[PDB]
Design a protein around this ligand. Structure first.
Ligand SMILES: Cc1cc2nc3c(=O)[nH]c(=O)nc-3n(C[C@H](O)[C@H](O)[C@H](O)COP(=O)(O)O)c2cc1C
Ligand code: SF4
Ligand code: SF4
Ligand code: SF4
Ligand code: FES
Ligand code: FES
Ligand SMILES: [Zn+2]
Lengths: 232, 108, 435, 187, 219
């Protein structure tokens, strides 16, 4: 009959393994119980729950959609509608690191477009495509609210501030290779680890996250020029 | 047929498919009859047609002894298969698409 | 005016995000001060403070809180019990150029948590949610850690500070969508639906999350609460002006030396902020800039001295927005920047309503033609006509935000837009790259 | 049966409390263009086709969603040039991505889009750019064929399948210009 | 009354005559009103005509005879009251200031949805001396389709009044002989009435047939 979208179309429709094995669903339900228990309404836990299935695979698949529908009593259509709406729910097997150059107006014009072009030419892949080594998946992301840290390069949703194109290619080489340079502001972890973190399950005590230069510039200038909060 | 004041055109559409394609695009006129004992030669059909598939020739000789012989079907009306043309049931010209046909960007 | 470190005060300290570091500087004192006062007392206390909402709109925080229909009286709800109130904190910060909430959350998230608790008390909401955009995973980790610490220290849960108050706080990690930042879209996304805006009415005050009363506040508007609690209303009012008092974070970014967050009183002029930052990138001049994020109409040199406050921006037609202060100089092409913004809006549109969904697509294509060789003089008039057809007509304000860059850019640089008809963008992208 | 009186265009009428502007304008004989509105569906105001100028309101208001208040004044495209401009612009934006499919579209002749583009549309295209395109048609069941390019994304199908029938097996999917009515994967 | 005549009440958008092919569009109620009486300063010679008429007739006779005055597209219609038609026509023809010598005929028009006013006879009159023209309109019910014949005033009407009867059944009482002129004397029904079916036959085609236009859908 050919029901549903054609497989080769737009951003790839949710496709992949039709269902998870028994034990996989056992673990998924074990985590989903905790995810559901924290909301006044079951459906409220859909966005976390989707991350959880995106944590099981490298990307959303029909199996994840089915599990979320079964847990929340929804239809696969409603779950798909919610899932396809948000960009963070990748729809292709994602590499060990999702490297997204912020191509927004400011970051791009501050140099981000050069970052993205250089990375695309170096990795040999276009944004949204995974490297054959399966370690990096390039992307171009909208504003990440790190505009001060211009040409910001995002990696597994950690920050890399003030990235030059050379710095960007060094960073992607490090990621595809064994050891990557640390995030300028954040603690890097594998993509599936980030998925479990967005689900609210990862241990939040991970190190890193110093203020950095831009977050302080104002306070530094105030101190160097004797400014302060006036007084009670 | 919509525009014909005399209800002298009968058209049934049908789907074009890869196994059998008669026109560019999703629809084609599988059945196309003109009842020339109802056609008044007004020409509104022509002005109605959006593809120029329907034209009016200058050929006029027509008369028959049967009421039914003057209900001319699709196979009587289709223009002669000019040189460079192939049989109607075939895929579009390679790489071309219905838009390429309507813009006139097609050749044998 | 001078910078005024209030939230930025703690930063540059060792691991300021910790609860010990926060306590060392009058942390969670404001929560106690509020908890001593009556809920309506706290609402009035904030309302007198003004504290206009720091996320986009600028609506007074106090009135927004008061609109929640408190039972009050003698507790006469003998029939259908009053449905629970909710405090959904909007930690989503997706407006382009807007990077004030993220640093605040990462460095000293407790300002929020504290304030959030206070806000929950003010509206008497038994539950509170901090909807924080994903893609800031460091910030999400910081915020989860802060909330866990708050639970450990008895500031969240039940019998908070022995006030009889109970409050459970949840950090919801939103997936990727700019539109989720709007109230009633934040709510649908938190309810596990497509992050699309709802109708209004019914407003969130009467029926928001789960059709129950809700108040959505930007993280800046909340984290500004503990300061006014501890330092009083009079301290807050000394800053800014009567029609827009207080302090705000300004995310100086773009072609500027020393970009970063500057905590300054409302009404600080861009001249003063550039002087503090040291001015635009050396050797170039301010060409254009956005007071708020991209959602706000562009500004140019002729407004360098116009105050950065709600009334001041309304005085020029721009909206203060989120105090993003994106800065661009001679090297940048207005058409190029506006094209990228239109691309962002087309990508981030929820698609719900015809004006935004279709017009943003069309404008993105028109700008693509402009930047490329194609493009005609009639194309500028078409851009303006389409923007007019989007502005006001779109279901939510995202359409207005999409139209604003286009309309302001044409109004200020029709000359450059025309010059782009010569065969494309004359500018060389390499020249604008913060090296 | 509290009756609220209001003037639509120049004329005046009185209608039950809570009646929508579009319903009142129907009752008084005025065809406000509309796609997403449906009397039996909860109003959604999505397509923005039904905009009208309302006294005291800066923005045009979707007549399909504007509950009638006492003493309101409203001016449709028949008397408000601003409302006319709003509706015509929405119509244009509605047609730019629409396929040139009328001869092959089954809805041809009975299409509300055709009729309301005649009554409330510009004479000719202003859109010289590239239209959005989907592979079409695609079956969402054994019975129903979906043509996403022609979809004006009014959500009436989805809103019906949720509100009227408890069968949300289609929904609006994807985002932005790419939004499309769809079934889950193959269900 | 000054309220217009509604000859039909369209239901729903797009001119659907029935439920409609798309749901939710059928709730509009658009009455089909002909133009109402023109306010007073009728354009051009129309005032000059009507005033003169109002002078030749009395105030009472004028008010009882002329039911309405409708100027539309610079064409003057005098919706005259039944029974009084011969008097008004005589005044128009005879009065030197009006002197509408030439009555161009009579045309029936059927409005089944106009209560008590189903059948309208239209009399185009022209005054050659004054180079003027107007249209009288006399409305009669379906149950009492009788109208006074103008034969004594306009002999030209005799055939027209006949055709109009044949086609509508408007009984011009006082006409010498209202025999059918177009249709056979034994013909049943009055074809130009809407109630009369079009009486077509399906058009034949190889393997199919098209029903007449009155059966197939319309908008
Ligand atoms: C498209 C759109 C996106 C928005 N995104 C945000 C956002 O990311 N963060 C934010 O604080 N406000 C955002 N807003 C403004 C919200 O209205 C605001 O968060 C909420 O109403 C509370 O505002 P307040 O805290 O200033 O009182 C957005 C508004 C629109 C229309
Ligand atoms: S000429 Fe064409 S339109 Fe006219 S009656 Fe004949 S078939 Fe119909
Ligand atoms: S303007 Fe309309 S389409 Fe755009 S984001 Fe808002 S609701 Fe969605
Ligand atoms: S398919 Fe659904 S959303 Fe699209 S036009 Fe039809 S009813 Fe509207
Ligand atoms: S412009 Fe890229 S993070 Fe804001
Ligand atoms: S019919 Fe009202 S907005 Fe669509
Ligand atoms: Zn350019």
């Amino acid at each position: 009959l050919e029901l549903g979208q054609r497989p080769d179309e737009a951003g790839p429709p949710i496709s992949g393994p039709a269902t998870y094995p028994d034990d996989v669903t056992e673990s998924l339900r074990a985590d989903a119980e905790q995810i559901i228990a924290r909301y006044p309404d079951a459906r409220s836990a859909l966005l976390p729950l989707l991350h959880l299935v995106q944590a099981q695979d490298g990307y959303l698949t029909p199996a994840g959609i089915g599990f979320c529908a079964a847990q929340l009593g929804l239809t696969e259509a409603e779950v798909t509608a919610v899932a396809t709406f948000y960009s963070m729910y990748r729809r292709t097997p994602t590499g060990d690191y999702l490297v997204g150059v912020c191509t927004n107006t400011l970051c791009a014009i501050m140099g981000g477009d050069a970052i993205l072009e250089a990375l695309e030419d170096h990795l040999g892949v276009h944004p949204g495509q995974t490297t054959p080594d399966g370690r990096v998946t390039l992307e171009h992301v909208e504003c990440n609210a790190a505009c001060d840290y211009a040409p910001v390069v995002m990696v597994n949703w950690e920050f890399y501030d003030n990235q030059t194109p050379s710095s960007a290619r060094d960073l992607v080489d490090g990621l595809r290779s064994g050891s990557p340079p640390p995030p300028t502001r954040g603690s890097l972890c594998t993509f599936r680890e980030t998925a479990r973190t967005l689900a609210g399950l990862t241990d939040p005590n991970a190190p890193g996250g110093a203020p950095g230069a831009a977050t302080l510039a104002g306070l530094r200038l105030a101190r160097e020029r004797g400014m302060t909060a006036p007084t009670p | 047929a919509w525009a014909c004041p005399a209800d002298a055109i009968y058209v049934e559409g049908a789907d074009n498919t890869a196994d059998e394609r008669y026109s560019p695009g999703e629809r084609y006129g599988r059945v196309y009859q003109i009842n020339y004992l109802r056609c008044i030669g007004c020409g509104l059909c022509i002005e109605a047609c959006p593809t120029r598939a329907l034209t009016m020739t200058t050929e006029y000789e027509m008369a028959d002894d049967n009421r039914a012989d003057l209900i001319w079907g699709k196979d009587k009306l289709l223009a002669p298969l000019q040189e460079g043309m192939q049989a109607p049931p075939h895929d579009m010209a390679p790489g071309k698409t219905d838009d390429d046909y309507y813009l006139g960007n097609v050749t044998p | 005016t001078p910078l005024t470190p209030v939230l930025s005060r703690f930063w540059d300290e060792p691991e300021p995000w910790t609860l010990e570091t926060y306590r060392r500087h009058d942390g969670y004192q404001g929560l106690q001060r509020a908890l001593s006062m009556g809920p309506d007392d706290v609402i009035a206390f904030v309302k007198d403070s003004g504290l206009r909402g720091r996320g986009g709109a600028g609506f007074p925080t106090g009135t927004k809180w008061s609109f929640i229909p408190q039972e009050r009286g003698d507790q006469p709800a003998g029939g259908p019990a009053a449905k629970p109130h909710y405090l959904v904190i909007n930690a989503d910060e997706s407006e382009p150029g807007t990077c004030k909430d993220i640093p605040l959350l990462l460095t000293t998230p407790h300002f929020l948590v504290e304030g959030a608790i206070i806000a929950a008390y003010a509206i008497r909401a038994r539950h509170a949610f901090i909807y924080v955009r994903g893609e800031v995973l460091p910030v999400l980790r910081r915020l989860q850690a802060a909330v866990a610490e708050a639970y450990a220290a008895g500031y969240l849960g039940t019998d908070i500070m022995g006030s009889g108050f109970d409050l459970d706080l949840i950090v919801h990690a939103g997936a990727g969508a700019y539109i989720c930042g709007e109230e009633t879209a934040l709510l649908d996304s938190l309810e596990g639906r497509r992050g699309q805006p709802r109708l209004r009415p019914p407003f969130p005050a009467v029926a928001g999350l789960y059709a129950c009363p809700t108040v959505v506040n930007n993280v800046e508007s909340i984290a500004s609460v503990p300061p006014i609690m501890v330092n009083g209303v009079d301290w807050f009012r000394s800053m800014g002006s009567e029609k827009s008092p207080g302090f705000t974070l300004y995310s100086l970014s773009g072609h500027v030396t020393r970009p970063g967050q500057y905590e300054a009183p409302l009404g600080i002029t861009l001249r003063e902020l550039l002087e503090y930052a040291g001015g635009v990138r050396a050797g170039h001049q301010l060409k254009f800039w956005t007071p708020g994020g991209s959602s706000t109409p562009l500004l140019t040199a002729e407004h360098l001295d116009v105050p950065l406050d709600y009334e001041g921006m309304a005085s020029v037609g721009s909206m203060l927005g989120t105090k993003a202060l994106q800065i661009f100089d001679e090297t940048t092409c207005v058409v190029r920047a506006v094209r990228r913004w239109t691309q962002f809006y087309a990508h981030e549109s929820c698609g719900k309503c015809t004006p935004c969904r279709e017009g943003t697509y069309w404008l993105a294509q028109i700008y693509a033609r402009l930047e490329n060789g194609a493009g005609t003089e009639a194309d500028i008039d078409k851009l303006l006509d389409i923007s007019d057809n989007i502005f006001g007509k779109s279901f939510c304000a995202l359409g207005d935000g999409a139209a604003s860059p286009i309309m302001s850019s044409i109004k200020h640089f029709r000359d450059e837009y025309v010059a782009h008809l010569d065969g494309g963008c004359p500018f060389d992208p390499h020249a604008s790259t913060l090296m | 049966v509290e009756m609220v009186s209001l003037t639509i265009d120049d004329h005046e009428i009185s209608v039950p409390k809570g009646t929508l502007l579009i319903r009142a304008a129907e009752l008084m004989g005025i065809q406000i263009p509309r796609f997403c509105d449906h009397p039996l569906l909860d109003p959604v105001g999505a397509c923005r086709q039904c905009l009208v100028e309302v006294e005291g309101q800066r923005k045009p208001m979707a007549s399909c969603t504007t509950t009638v208040m006492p003493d309101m004044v409203v001016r449709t495209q028949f008397t408000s040039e601003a409302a006319d401009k709003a509706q015509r612009g929405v119509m244009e934006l509605l047609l730019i991505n629409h396929p040139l499919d009328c001869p092959i579209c089954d809805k041809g002749g009975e299409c509300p889009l055709q009729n309301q583009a005649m009554s409330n549309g510009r004479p000719e295209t202003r859109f010289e750019d590239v239209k959005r395109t989907f592979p079409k048609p695609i079956s969402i069941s054994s019975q129903v064929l979906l043509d996403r390019e022609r979809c004006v994304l009014c959500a009436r199908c989805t809103r019906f399948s949720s509100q009227i029938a408890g069968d949300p097996f289609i929904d609006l999917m994807e985002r932005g210009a790419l939004q499309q009515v769809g079934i889950g994967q193959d269900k | 009354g000054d309220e217009p005549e509604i000859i039909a009440v369209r239901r729903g958008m797009f001119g659907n005559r029935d439920t409609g092919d798309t749901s939710g569009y059928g709730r509009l109620v658009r009455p089909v009103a002909l133009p109402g009486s023109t306010p007073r300063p009728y354009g051009g010679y129309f005032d000059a005509v009507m005033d003169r008429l109002a002078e030749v007739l009395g105030e009472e006779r004028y008010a009882m005879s002329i039911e309405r005055v409708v100027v539309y597209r610079d064409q003057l219609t005098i919706e005259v009251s039944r029974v009084q038609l011969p008097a008004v026509a005589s005044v128009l023809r005879d009065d030197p200031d009006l002197r509408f010598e030439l009555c161009l005929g009579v045309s029936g028009v059927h409005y089944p949805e106009d209560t008590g006013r189903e059948l309208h006879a239209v009399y185009p009159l022209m005054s050659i001396t004054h180079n003027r023209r107007i249209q009288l309109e006399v409305a009669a019910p379906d149950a009492d389709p009788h109208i006074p014949s103008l034969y004594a005033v306009y002999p030209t009407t005799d055939w027209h009044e006949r055709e109009t009867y044949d086609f509508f059944g408007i009984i011009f009482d006082g006409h010498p002989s209202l025999t059918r002129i177009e249709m056979p004397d034994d013909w049943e029904g009055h074809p130009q009435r809407k109630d009369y079916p079009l009486g077509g036959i399906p058009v034949e085609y190889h393997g199919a047939q098209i029903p007449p236009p009155d059966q197939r859908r319309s908008y």
